[PDB]
């Protein structure tokens, strides 16, 4: 089901108009709160002293109807960036009046046009409405993919439409929006109602709006092609755009008169497109709810994870068959067939939780036809209760549970294989490098560690939405920009990947090395082909469990149906303009003292940011 409204500029009986619209199947109606042509004067007599009423009564609809069904529209004559001072002054008063009337009514949203370049005074007056009274009304900026000037019929003899591609020029309507929302200080209440035209522009023009807070998509009846039977439809290229907007769950407005049949037909088509799409895959079903939801990354070393947190980890049996296989392959490479009875291998699950890897090790040994000795080292003592109850009931003497920190544990004997899953969304963000370094002393000189290797990846992104979400995490009793100097786990959804992920930090286990130092400093250069705004860097990772067996959340090499891990986000404080052809150069440090580990970062090109999270002031990872 698609949430869909009707846009009208002519309402004689608000009662009948609504009922007609509701019978057609529209969730809501966009309409004028005053008469579109009822121009008003606020300064010059005699016109200023005009006998009221100035508009319709609020009593004509219920409070519930005003709150849910009606979307107000600014009067088309209200032009507060007019060149004429008098029109400017009248429009300011007219705008506030209309917006204040929408507030008085409790309207869910109010529409405003962005149809020229300089909308500076419109932005000013809107900002003032926002800091005057206490109301929850949304504001939908009607702005087109392509300006009417750029799609006009080539029919003025002495003013022909240039037939030269203007790359940045074709994106001008994005800049109309960018300057408006920048002027209004990135208010969460100012969203986009993107208007679509009959001929779509180049892909880079549409792609420009990825990341932007699109709350609606306006479809004029005129853009619909007619088919053999007579219904309205859209071109295959328009549908692609609709399916993309459907992922953003935008509200679809239908503007203009019925050129076609019913009106339900325009609406029925949107339903038909919505019914017939690729269904929500097993990753995306699990992720439904968490789209662009910021979370603190887990620190299972410093904290003790909850029973349900472990339960979540365990709903990914794909991951554990990958762990099963990697262990299975390793057993064969170590224990030759003739030695199978004599030679019992010492496996040590380091950070076992509730023993999914313990079972995967028991099963890998069963499928390999080789004998093993298990140790289940778990730091969390609450999880140890789970193990020790499994261990009494099923496992028996084969599994020895060890309630200790792997770095502290005095082992009775060395290990053939150390298995572990201490990897966060950025791989090393849970301090697996430091953990396994401490456990390294009790690996045999020829011992394997599963995973043998892990690498973190990074990619610059554009989401003015996710920038705003990070911005809203300002908290009492701390640095007022601390929220920008810390990573977030988040299913990135409305965003734009500005360059292919390149690798950041890498660790190998066992770390065969004299002076083991886990601190890092990596410089990356990202080639950017688009005009955009950088707001952060997505983080992913990849790990080699054993040989060709891998786990990955890197989008291009993603391990199949692995919903457990979501990407990580390193935001920046101030968004950076990046032109087509420019290079985003980011710096990342991994740092540590005896007590804590952290990331610092900075963009050095095309302009320098500040160094983010210096000395772990806003974010650290507890050793």
């Amino acid at each position: 089901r698609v949430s869909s409204g009707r846009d009208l500029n002519c309402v004689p009986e608000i009662a009948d108009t609504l009922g007609a619209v509701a019978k057609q199947g529209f969730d809501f109606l966009c309409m004028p709160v005053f008469h579109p042509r009822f121009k008003r004067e606020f300064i010059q007599e005699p016109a200023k002293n005009r006998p009221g009423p100035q508009t319709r009564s609020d009593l004509l609809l219920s409070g519930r109807d005003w709150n849910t069904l009606i979307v107000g529209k600014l009067s088309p004559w209200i032009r507060p960036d007019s060149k004429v001072e008098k029109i400017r002054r009248n429009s300011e008063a007219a705008m506030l009046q209309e917006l204040n009337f929408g507030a008085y009514l409790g309207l869910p949203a109010f529409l405003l046009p962005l149809n020229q370049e300089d909308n500076t005074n419109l932005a000013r007056v809107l900002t003032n409405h926002i800091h005057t009274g206490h109301h929850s009304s949304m504001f939908w900026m009607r702005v087109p993919l392509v300006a009417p000037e750029d799609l006009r019929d080539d029919i003025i003899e002495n003013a022909p439409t240039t037939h030269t591609e203007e790359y940045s020029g074709e994106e001008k309507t994005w800049m109309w929006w960018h300057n408006f929302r920048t002027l209004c200080d990135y208010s969460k209440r100012i969203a986009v109602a993107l208007e679509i035209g009959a001929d779509l522009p180049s892909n880079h023009v549409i792609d420009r709006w990825l990341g932007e807070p699109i709350k609606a998509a306006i479809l004029p009846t005129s853009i619909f092609l007619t088919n053999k039977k007579g219904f309205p439809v859209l071109s295959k290229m328009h549908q692609r755009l609709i399916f993309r907007l459907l992922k953003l769950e935008v509200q679809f407005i239908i503007t203009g008169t019925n050129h076609h049949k019913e009106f339900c037909s325009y609406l029925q088509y949107l339903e038909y497109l919505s019914q017939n799409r690729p269904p929500p895959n097993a990753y995306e079903l699990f992720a439904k709810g968490y789209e662009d939801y910021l979370q603190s990354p887990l620190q299972p070393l410093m904290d003790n994870l909850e029973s349900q947190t472990y339960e979540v980890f365990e709903k990914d049996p794909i991951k554990y068959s990958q762990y099963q296989q990697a262990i299975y392959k390793c057993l064969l490479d170590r224990v030759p067939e003739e030695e199978k009875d004599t030679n019992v291998q010492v496996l040590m699950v380091l950070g076992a939780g509730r023993g999914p890897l313990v079972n995967a090790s028991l099963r890998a040994a069963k499928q390999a036809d080789r004998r093993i000795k298990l140790y289940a080292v778990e730091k969390n003592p609450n999880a140890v209760v789970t193990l020790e109850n499994w261990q009494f009931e099923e496992w028996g003497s084969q599994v020895t549970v060890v309630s200790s920190d792997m770095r502290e544990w005095v082992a009775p004997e060395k290990a053939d294989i150390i298995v572990s899953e201490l990897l966060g969304s950025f791989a090393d963000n849970e301090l697996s490098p430091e953990c396994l370094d401490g456990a390294q002393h009790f690996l045999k000189d020829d011992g394997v560690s599963i995973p043998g290797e892990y690498t973190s990846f990074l990619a610059p992104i554009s989401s003015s939405k996710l920038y705003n979400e990070v911005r809203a995490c300002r908290e009492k009793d701390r640095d007022p920009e601390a929220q920008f100097e810390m990573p977030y786990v988040v299913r990135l959804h409305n965003f734009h990947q500005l360059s292919a992920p390149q690798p950041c930090f890498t660790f190998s286990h066992p770390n065969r090395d004299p002076m083991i130092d886990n601190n890092r400093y990596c410089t990356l250069e990202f080639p950017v082909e688009v005009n955009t705004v950088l707001h952060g860097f997505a983080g992913y990772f990849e790990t080699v469990l054993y040989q060709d067996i891998t786990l990955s959340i890197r989008p291009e090499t993603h391990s199949p149906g692995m919903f457990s891990w979501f990407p990580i986000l390193f935001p920046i404080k101030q968004p950076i303009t990046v032109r087509e052809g420019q290079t985003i150069c980011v710096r990342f440090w991994r740092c540590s003292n005896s007590k804590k580990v952290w990331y610092e970062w900075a963009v050095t090109a095309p302009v320098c940011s500040a160094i983010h999270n210096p000395t772990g002031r806003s974010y650290t990872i507890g050793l």
Partner: protein, 299 residues
């Protein structure tokens, strides 16, 4: 029963009967109406009218189409043709065709009388065939709302248009590229051709300037304090120019645009003006104050 407060249009037909268009721009119900007055001095009184009718929506502009035809520009997005019946008591709808996508703001009949052009807030201009009841041609020349369209009085294929994109287009549909842009500045708001001189028109802007323009190749006067809404030349051989505004004033002007008459009887926006064909010194105006004022211009 009641005629709507906001009087938009007023035009005299050949014999001297007065057409009044109007709409409700406030209150419970936003609808329009059309009204014929065979006694002009009786307007606006509803009880003393020859004919009247209710339209479903407002009335942004209208014009006469011969002697019994009333072409209307509504908020609904439709251009409507109403006609009188065989004894001029009823006003019946001939057609009502929803082809523009937004408020139809402006309308004008071409020289032939069998076609007309319309302008809307949808930015489109359309040439209509009034017999076949269809759009022949649709032009999206402008980049903003179509404010005014004015048919060439004598050349059936020519007309003017103006818009919130700052353009004034001189049309000529005999070309493969009909529109042509004309310079002198603030947005054009009203348009009027000179009746005698085929090559001349005048435009009023939103700043209250009226300016004289020759198609080949420029005098101008600051007449009003606010937007020039309408411009109607008189039916004299040497015609005077009546200029309206949103300052609630009226001025009649000469050839060189100097000021002869001034009228501040109007208490709200002056929406139309129309000269009496019988008495050329008598000029009739309407407005949103609901007044039908009749001036005696000192000719």
């Amino acid at each position: 029963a009641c005629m709507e407060r906001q009087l938009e249009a007023a035009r005299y037909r050949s014999d001297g009967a007065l057409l009044l268009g109007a709409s409700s721009l406030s209150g419970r119900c936003w609808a329009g109406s059309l009204w014929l007055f065979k006694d002009p001095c009786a307007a606006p009184n509803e009880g003393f009218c020859s004919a009247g009718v209710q339209t479903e929506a407002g009335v942004a502009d209208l014009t006469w189409v011969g002697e019994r035809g009333i072409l209307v520009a509504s908020d609904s997005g439709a251009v409507e043709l109403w006609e009188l019946d065989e004894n001029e008591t009823l006003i019946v709808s001939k057609f009502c065709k929803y082809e523009h996508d937004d408020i139809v703001s402006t309308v004008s009949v071409l020289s032939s009388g069998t076609q007309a052009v319309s302008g809307s807030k949808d930015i489109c201009i359309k040439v209509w065939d009034l017999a076949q009841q269809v759009v022949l041609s649709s032009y999206r020349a402008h980049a903003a709302q179509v404010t005014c369209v004015a048919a060439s009085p004598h050349k059936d294929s020519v007309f003017l248009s103006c818009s919130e994109d700052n353009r004034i287009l001189l049309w000529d549909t005999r070309c493969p590229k009909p529109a042509s842009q004309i310079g002198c500045g603030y947005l054009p708001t009203s348009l009027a051709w000179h009746p005698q001189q085929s090559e001349v028109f005048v435009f009023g802007d939103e700043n209250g300037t009226v300016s004289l323009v020759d198609t080949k190749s420029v005098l101008s006067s600051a007449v009003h304090s606010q937007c020039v809404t309408g411009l109607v030349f008189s039916p004299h051989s040497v015609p005077f120019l009546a200029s309206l505004s949103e300052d609630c004033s009226l001025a009649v002007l000469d050839s060189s645009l100097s000021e002869l008459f001034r009228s501040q009887a109007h208490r709200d926006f002056v929406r139309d003006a129309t000269w009496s064909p019988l008495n050329h010194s008598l000029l009739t105006t309407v407005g949103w104050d609901h007044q039908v004022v009749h001036h005696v211009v000192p000719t």
